[PDB]
Design a protein around this ligand. Sequence first.
Ligand SMILES: Nc1ncnc2c1ncn2[C@@H]1O[C@H](COP(=O)(O)OP(=O)(O)O)[C@@H](O)[C@H]1O
Lengths: 816, 306
Amino acid sequence: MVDAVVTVFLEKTLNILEEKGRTVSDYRKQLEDLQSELKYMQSFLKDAERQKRTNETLRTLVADLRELVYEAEDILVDCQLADGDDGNEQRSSNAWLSRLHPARVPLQYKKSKNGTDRWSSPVYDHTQVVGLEGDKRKIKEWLFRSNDSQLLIMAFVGMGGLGKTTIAQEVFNDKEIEHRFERRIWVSVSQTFTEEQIMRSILRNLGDASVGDDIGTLLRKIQQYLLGKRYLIVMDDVWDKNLSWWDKIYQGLPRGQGGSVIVTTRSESVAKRVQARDDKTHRPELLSPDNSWLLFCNVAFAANDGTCERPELEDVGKEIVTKCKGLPLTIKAVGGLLLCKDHVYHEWRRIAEHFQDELRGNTSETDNVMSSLQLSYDELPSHLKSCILTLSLYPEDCVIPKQQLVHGWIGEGFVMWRNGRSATESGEDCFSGLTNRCLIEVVDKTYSGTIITCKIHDMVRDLVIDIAKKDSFSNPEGLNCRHLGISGNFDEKQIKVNHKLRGVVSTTKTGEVNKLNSDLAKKFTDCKYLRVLDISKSIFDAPLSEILDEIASLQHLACLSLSNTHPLIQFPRSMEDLHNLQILDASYCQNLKQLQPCIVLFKKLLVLDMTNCGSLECFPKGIGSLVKLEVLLGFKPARSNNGCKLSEVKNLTNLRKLGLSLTRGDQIEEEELDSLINLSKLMSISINCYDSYGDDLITKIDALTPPHQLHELSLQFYPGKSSPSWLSPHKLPMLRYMSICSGNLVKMQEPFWGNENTHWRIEGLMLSSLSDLDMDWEVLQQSMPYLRTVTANWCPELESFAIEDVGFRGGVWMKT
Amino acid sequence: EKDKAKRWFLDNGSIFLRELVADCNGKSIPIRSFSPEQILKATNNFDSSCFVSQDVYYKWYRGEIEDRSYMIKRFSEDEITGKRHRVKEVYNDIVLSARMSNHSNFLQLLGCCLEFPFPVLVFEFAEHGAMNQRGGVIVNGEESLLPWSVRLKIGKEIANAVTYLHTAFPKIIIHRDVKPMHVFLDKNWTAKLSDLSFSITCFVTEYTDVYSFGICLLVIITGKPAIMTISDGDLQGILSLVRELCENGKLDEVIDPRLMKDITSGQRLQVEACVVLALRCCKERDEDRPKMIQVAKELKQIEASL
Ligand SMILES: Nc1ncnc2c1ncn2[C@@H]1O[C@H](COP(=O)(O)OP(=O)(O)O)[C@@H](O)[C@H]1O
């Protein structure tokens, strides 16, 4: 990733050489030759990390070229904010430029002969599946015979990434199997399991919280929420060390009511300990030499929908596939990389030759998957290397939220936004470009196709940890770390913190909270070059306005994210003189009873995210004085002068997401209903009227006209009885997604159907738990031509829909 | 003195956050934090005619903040302290009442003052308070009327909400005691369930909620209380008496004289189809009781039959 650090430093020299706050001075001439030598580094930096292995004499040189760019940045950004006289800064970088010639000449003896990935703009969602139908039916039919034994156990034994969890999730998630089994339980147990949240992760889909107590009360709710019903339990990736919980649970769940247990595991020697009667153990198969190339065509082309139209690369496409032996994720990782190139026979044969020579030492088979993932990591573009490198820190098979990653990637300068492309859209095409190489698989979606959470395959993170530990970006079990993070309850370590430390994230596994102390929390503000202080879910011992008093010592913050922290009331009083701070995320902190008035002052930020802060009295008045921000959520405008109004939002030309939280009718003033009309770049509003008292709130929502080019909207509560008379296909033509949550809305007005010869162009629609709607179904389809999905959730009195029971359970209604 | 307040604040918000992240993955509904002086002023220090009802654990109170009224629910100290197995149910109530708020038949939680020990909930002021033990708000005067269509709407409106407790989420919730103590009334007489602090043979299943809802459905129609005895030892079952009335008296004593003035065309055929549903709702064999998702469908079918 030395190319991935030099590409960051070159743009931080582009945006400070062109800034012209320092026209001609001392340390500028010695910076332009620094960038002119780092641009000549990059002709041979890609093959340097291709040859970090097999030459330690190259490894130490590349490690020093890496480590000196960090000292370059820590004196670049300290001299960006200075505008003073510091003679003790030029003659340091004189050495740290003059010592780079002994860091290139011994490398140029050894070789001896931008950051825009243009294959990231369409996202593909590669999850197709091939060659399993017989092998899926022949273990359907075992589960339809679950009554013939007292209890059934399914044992899947294969190698790493052979396709075990996929054939699990095509039987666990089938319709006619869902009719047979009442409840079904999907739990992942690995070597980090702690033996209690196995039971709590089972019980999380069975009804109640697990108070910390004895194992008997743990078993009582499992036995009474599964009292003789036909259940299903999938425990996944079971490891034989500390296996003995399986007999502490297997002698506790009731036999004699049908059901089955699915246990997937790698090693063969534990399947007898599974005691699963080997004919009902199932070893999945390697792919055939025809289906493997079919999956390769289905991934690697994806624009002609899986057809080799150009015949000059058909031979090479078969010849690469017949090296990776029909094992699925090797061929899909290679196909995900070959999606990114697609055209030139030379560019295909070059990485075919690199896949051939890089693989020639295995004497193994998992070395094949860890050779092809190394191939996919090396041939990746530059700044995405650090993007998957920061994903190493998340724990064993965790569920990783998307904004947690993306607001980190814009934190350490791993992102690029230069020419009107917004920094929140460029923060996520660098995610969609990682979902194209099949290095990141998407787990959760919305109705609108956006992504909430995320995870990676288990064999991938071993590569990512191994490539991080050699390069000192991870391994908290130790000291040298560029970016650290604390997982669930590691205060007993009390990790020593020093001047490198370019980030702290908090990683919890969806339900747990890592409680902290006042001991190590004060040690964050002893750092002096920290970037990302991302402390999510947290219980402290002191209020945060006392803990974080020392942010005067910090200056290079890019983002706070204090979300779901309990002991905070005020943001700390010495946030007055931070300068950069591109993101202040503080959502769901539901008793910060004032937002501190210094956020008028810094003109830098991009994201101000405060969804559902249930007690927050309006956003001090100068919020129209920061022309750069883009995501403004949870607004709550003022009464008379105690904050800012919607007339202040009219200036912010750069925003694209917006979220209002209108609660009283006197928040919207009458002479400024004209506000939300000229925001040319807006994409998704959301109006959350949870507390709502006045009747004038209805007559002051309905006069708000959202812009001509709105792409998405959503109405959370909206206590009005009918439609707001701007939900018409005239006044918002290009609307493509729309969702209406709970409330008191009864019928839709006559301009809503808009029955001219014009229509809606809506492709997605959600109608969750309203209780008083009455609309037909043929009137929808005549008025709205190309709906695809209608997810209605809990809305009775709409029985014209083809959803199965529209008033008592969700449906989707995929289009025919 | 005030040092005691913040030590309450740290512990109660730590326990509240640890419960809410476990129950909802952090994401929730906006909960607004009150200073304790506002609640002590809104009910005149809990020491007036502001209280609506009471229970062993909790006590309701009518609240007044500026131009907006509320239903404050406090928790009693000395019946919970010493029983930590009750202490975690205290917070299970205030987390389920904040997750269940985005369905229309549960009364919305507008905030929570957590400065007090065992924190104090607040809710929307449904201006007709707690339904008494036979049906009807008390009145600002003294008595209610309850026409039959309002009683049928409040009959099926609870039935939707019990299935929202059973089939909405990927986990089920056992509201252990449905009673008309727990049903309030909004301005259009829409039922709003509440105070699900219980929420947990000596084992409760899904069907023991149905066994309660059958008696709650016949007590609205008859108007005679859940302990029905007229000078015959003060305790005999209402349910067996309604069985003998169906077997011998044959649908003549089942409607109260308070609703004896709905004698339009048939109007009692749906009463028959509702009391027959209440009787099948209360069978002793748990494999012969209708599931809760079908009771709401059958009451909607009854209501749309006119
Ligand atoms: N039969 C198949 N057809 C297409 N893709 C497959 C098949 N089997 C496995 N895969 C791919 O393998 C990837 C992950 O393999 P997985 O089953 O998760 O390995 P493991 O079971 O060891 O965790 C998935 O993204 C899936 O696309």
